[PDB]
Amino acid sequence: LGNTTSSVILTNYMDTQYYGEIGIGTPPQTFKVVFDTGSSNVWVPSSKCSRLYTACVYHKLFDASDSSSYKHNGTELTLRYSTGTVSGFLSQDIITVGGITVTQMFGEVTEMPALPFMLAEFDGVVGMGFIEQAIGRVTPIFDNIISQGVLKEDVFSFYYNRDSENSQSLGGQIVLGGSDPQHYEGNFHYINLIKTGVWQIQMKGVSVGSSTLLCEDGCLALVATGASYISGSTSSIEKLMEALGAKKRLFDYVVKCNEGPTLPDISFHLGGKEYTLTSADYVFQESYSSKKLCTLAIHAMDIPPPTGPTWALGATFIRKFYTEFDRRNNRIGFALAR
Amino acid sequence: DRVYIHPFHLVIHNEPKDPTFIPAPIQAKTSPVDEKALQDQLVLVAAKLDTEDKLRAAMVGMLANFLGFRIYGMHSELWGVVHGATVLSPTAVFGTLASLYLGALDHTADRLQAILGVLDAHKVLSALQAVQGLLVAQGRADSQAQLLLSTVVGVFTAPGLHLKQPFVQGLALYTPVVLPRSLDFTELDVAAEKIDRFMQAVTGWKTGSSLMGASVDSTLAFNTYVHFQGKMKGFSLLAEPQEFWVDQSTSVSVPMLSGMGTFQHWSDIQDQFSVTQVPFTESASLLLIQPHYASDLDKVEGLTFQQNSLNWMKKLSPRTIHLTMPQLVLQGSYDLQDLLAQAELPAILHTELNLQKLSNDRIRVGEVLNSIFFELEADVLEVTLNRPFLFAVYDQSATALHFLGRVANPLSTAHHHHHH
Numbered sequence: 051l052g053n054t055t056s057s058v059i060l061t062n063y064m065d066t067q068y069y070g071e072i073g074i075g076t077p078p079q080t081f082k083v084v085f086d087t088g089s090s091n092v093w094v095p096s097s098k099c100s101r102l103y104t105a106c107v108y109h110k111l112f113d114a115s116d117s118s119s120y121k122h123n124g125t126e127l128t129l130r131y132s133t134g135t136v137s138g139f140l141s142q143d144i145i146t147v148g149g150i151t152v153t154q155m156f157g158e159v160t161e162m163p164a165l166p167f168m169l170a171e172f173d174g175v176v177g178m179g180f181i182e183q184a185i186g187r188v189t190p191i192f193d194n195i196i197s198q199g200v201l202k203e204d205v206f207s208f209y210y211n212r213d214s215e216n217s218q219s220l221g222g223q224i225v226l227g228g229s230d231p232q233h234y235e236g237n238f239h240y241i242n243l244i245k246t247g248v249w250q251i252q253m254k255g256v257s258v259g260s261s262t263l264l265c266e267d268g269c270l271a272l273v274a275t276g277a278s279y280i281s282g283s284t285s286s287i288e289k290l291m292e293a294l295g296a297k298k299r300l301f302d303y304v305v306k307c308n309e310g311p312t313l314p315d316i317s318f319h320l321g322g323k324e325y326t327l328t329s330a331d332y333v334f335q336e337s338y339s340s341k342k343l344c345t346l347a348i349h350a351m352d353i354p355p356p357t358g359p360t361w362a363l364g365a366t367f368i369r370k371f372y373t374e375f376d377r378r379n380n381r382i383g384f385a386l387a388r
Numbered sequence: 389d390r391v392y393i394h395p396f397h398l399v400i401h402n403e404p405k406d407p408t409f410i411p412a413p414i415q416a417k418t419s420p421v422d423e424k425a426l427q428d429q430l431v432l433v434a435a436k437l438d439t440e441d442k443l444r445a446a447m448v449g450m451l452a453n454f455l456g457f458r459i460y461g462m463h464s465e466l467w468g469v470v471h472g473a474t475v476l477s478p479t480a481v482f483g484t485l486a487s488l489y490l491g492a493l494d495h496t497a498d499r500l501q502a503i504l505g506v507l508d509a510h511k512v513l514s515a516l517q518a519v520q521g522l523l524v525a526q527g528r529a530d531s532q533a534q535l536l537l538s539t540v541v542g543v544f545t546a547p548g549l550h551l552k553q554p555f556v557q558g559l560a561l562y563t564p565v566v567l568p569r570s571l572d573f574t575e576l577d578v579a580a581e582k583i584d585r586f587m588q589a590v591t592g593w594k595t596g597s598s599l600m601g602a603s604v605d606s607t608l609a610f611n612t613y614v615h616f617q618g619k620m621k622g623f624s625l626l627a628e629p630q631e632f633w634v635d636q637s638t639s640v641s642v643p644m645l646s647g648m649g650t651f652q653h654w655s656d657i658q659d660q661f662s663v664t665q666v667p668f669t670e671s672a673s674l675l676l677i678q679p680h681y682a683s684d685l686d687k688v689e690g691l692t693f694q695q696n697s698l699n700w701m702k703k704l705s706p707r708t709i710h711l712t713m714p715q716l717v718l719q720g721s722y723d724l725q726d727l728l729a730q731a732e733l734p735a736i737l738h739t740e741l742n743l744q745k746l747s748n749d750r751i752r753v754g755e756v757l758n759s760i761f762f763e764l765e766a767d768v769l770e771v772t773l774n775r776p777f778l779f780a781v782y783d784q785s786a787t788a789l790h791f792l793g794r795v796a797n798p799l800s801t802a803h804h805h806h807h808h
């Protein structure tokens with residue numbers, strides 16, 4: 051009965067923030083949002099957010115009073131990240147994501163720390179994960195979209211473009227209901243999720259060159275579209291960066307820009323197949339000078355249990371491999387992006 | 389290259405008594421502030437920083453930038469350029485509110501905590517000292533001091549107001565030089581003269597208190613005085629001065645610093661402005677924004693500082709440039725209390741405030757003065773700053789804006805200490 055797919059065009063900011071637009075309310079109030087498979091909550095800044103919070107003042111605010119479809123809830127909501135925490139209250143309203151209108155519970159955020167959100171081009175987050183991950187056990191937006199039964203398939207897919215490879219053209223694309231064969235070549239290699247409730251799969255090993263340096267006895271791999279870099283445990287990333295000859299410069303891991311192009315391939319062993327990134331895929335080659343330091347698109351994030359410890363495959367991975375998230379068969383499909 | 393690009397990770401973790409004292413009368417004899425000794429003190433702080441300390445320093449650097457751009461925007465909106473120049477210090481403004489936070493409890497603490505954008509005042513103030521250390525420690529391989537940054541904090545209190553010692557000792561974590569003095573507020577114009585006289589004695593800087601336009605019940609002034617001296621690498625004082633065009637009908641002959649070499653540059657054709665980076669040291673530089681047409685300055689400020697971002701120095705690229713600009717000697721001040729009170733904010737430093745860790749006695753804030761003494765000194769595409777421009781002082785090592793500036797008129801004048 052349902053035969054519709056929907057395409058959301060994304061803006062690529064510095065190969066770190068891939069964001070699209072959603073409407074909330076009647077009439078729609080538009081917000082720039084990152085679509086994260088690593089989380090399950092929808093939240094945007096609130097009009098009720100104090101002007102003291104710089105991060106609220108320099109982003110779009112949701113005014114509930116200007117929405118004729120707004121329904122009050124007011125249940126407190128706290129979303130805890132690595133460094134900072136955003137908090138607010140739940141509200142219900144009609145959200146327009148793609149061309150699909152859906153009644154959705156989301157967070158009106160009234161407290162935003164300057165760090166890291168003053169570096170965010172996006173206003174809010176759309177969680178594309180499972181209700182098991184949703185704080186306050188709030189029904190995720192993609193569950194409520196499946197309930198409508200309008201989608202061709204209960205799947206969504208991600209294309210992220212390179213910022214340098216293309217200039218003044220498509221930053222990225224989310225498809226709800228299928229995958230766009232214009233942005234991937236060949237067929238999808240599908241890998242079953244370990245368990246429903248997380249976009250997480252088994253990883254057999256992580257190879258630097260031919261040798262398998264890390265994840266020798268097996269480990270976990272969360273596919274997080276909202277994560278800028280590939281992340282691993284502090285333990286794993288310190289070993290990886292030792293092997294690459296990369297040094298810590300303030301917050302970044304860097305190598306000399308001239309040594310960047312000779313850095314070895316990094317391979318992630320997923321579903322009995324090698325997913326390889328060359329130095330061109332995980333180094334930001336701003337220069338090729340022997341005096342300048344170039345940043346690696348890889349960092350340490352110690353994700354707590356029960357989801358972690360785990361690797362997170364972010365935009366660095368997805369830029370290489372077009373990714374299809376299949377809720378029907380609880381599996382992830384990877385194919386070469388073009 | 390010089391700007392931090394944050395990698396986002398949106399996976400949800402889901403995890404008896406205080407000694408007090410009446411400060412010494414302001415009239416009492418105090419020895420001048422030793423600026424050279426204060427620099428040496430900061431350089432040692434820098435040399436003893438571990439890599440975790442440098443990370444915490446870089447974080448408060450970024451926090452200070454965000455608040456600094458915001459409060460610069462408030463100044464620009466509410467007052468604009470007051471008689472030639474506006475100079476604001478993101479780090480000092482952040483330090484002032486972090487210093488008041490140390491003394492604050494309950495609603496006042498919560499509000500200050502929110503606007504700073506981050507609980508432990510001691511750690512924040514220590515990090516902010518590290519930021520200043522990381523700046524002045526640069527260029528100390530040679531005997532010449534390319535960078536000097538002196539901060540003096542005046543804490544002027546009415547009779548019967550006892551400062552708590554832990555508060556005063558706490559401020560030392562950020563600013564070693566803290567001068568608490570008892571001062572009569574019954575005549576506000578006489579009170580302002582006495583502060584300006586005392587600050588002239590101990591520093592030798594031209595200062596102007598705003599305390600005339602304060603509450604008659606005022607018991608506390610919390611004034612921050614900053615002196616920056618920056619020697620630009622490969623620049624000399626031209627013997628002959630050149631015309632600076634304030635407008636189409638007005639010019640002033642001023643001494644010009646001239647230097648030629650390889651400076652990072654970018655001419656933005658769409659937004660219509662040129663950026664130039666003149667280094668002081670390895671990591672610390674002077675940024676110079678120049679509108680392509682002199683009438684667009686407000687528009688250019690709108691697309692740079694007012695965006696509250698460093699994206700306008702992202703596209704910088706090396707270039708062979710001959711840079712001529714005025715030898716700046718700017719002495720000005722504004723009341724932070726008054727700025728915040730007239731801006732689009734809830735009340736922080738109102739009559740109903742709680743600074744009970746500062747004193748148990750009645751606190752009524754007369755002014756929170758931020759006073760800056762800014763000096764640029766000496767050691768093909770011609771970039772000539774002979775028309776109004778914006779500037780900033782940026783340190784890569786702490787991702788820290790030390791100063792934001794707008795120069796409509798490069799002349800020194802006492803009317804930079806005028807308060808609305």
Ligand SMILES: *[C@@H]1O[C@H](CO)[C@@H](O[C@@H]2O[C@H](CO)[C@@H](O[C@@H]3O[C@H](CO)[C@@H](O)[C@H](O[C@H]4O[C@H](CO)[C@@H](O)[C@H](O)[C@@H]4O[C@@H]4O[C@H](CO)[C@@H](O)[C@H](O)[C@H]4NC(C)=O)[C@@H]3O)[C@H](O)[C@H]2NC(C)=O)[C@H](O)[C@H]1NC(C)=O
Nearest residue numbers: 128130181182183184185186187355356357400401402403
């Ligand atoms: C994000 O983080 C928040 C905050 O930390 C989490 O919220 C917490 O979630 C906990 C669940 O893991 C909540 O803990 C429960 O609190 C209940 C009281 O309010 C209590 O009833 C529960 O106790 C039972 O379960 C425990 C297992 O975790 C057992 O150890 C315990 O013995 C109890 O077991 C039951 O016992 C009765 C009678 O004795 C039997 O009849 C039942 O059959 C038993 N059941 C089971 C399964 O054994 C438990 O302590 C906690 O309240 C809550 N905290 C707050 C402040 O709300 C979120 O979960 C987390 N979210 C995500 C997505 O990570």
Ligand SMILES: *[C@@H]1O[C@H](CO[C@@H]2O[C@@H](C)[C@@H](O)[C@@H](O)[C@@H]2O)[C@@H](O[C@@H]2O[C@H](CO)[C@@H](O)[C@H](O)[C@H]2NC(C)=O)[C@H](O)[C@H]1NC(C)=O
Nearest residue numbers: 121122123124125140141142153154155156186187188189
């Ligand atoms: C705020 O909403 C929650 C969730 O409400 C449910 O889901 C919404 C999307 C909407 O469809 C509602 O009609 C649903 O009821 C409320 O939590 C529920 O509380 C009831 C108790 O009356 C309970 O039966 C449900 O199991 C709860 N659901 C969850 C997920 O906890 C909550 O009561 C609302 N709060 C207010 C103040 O209105």
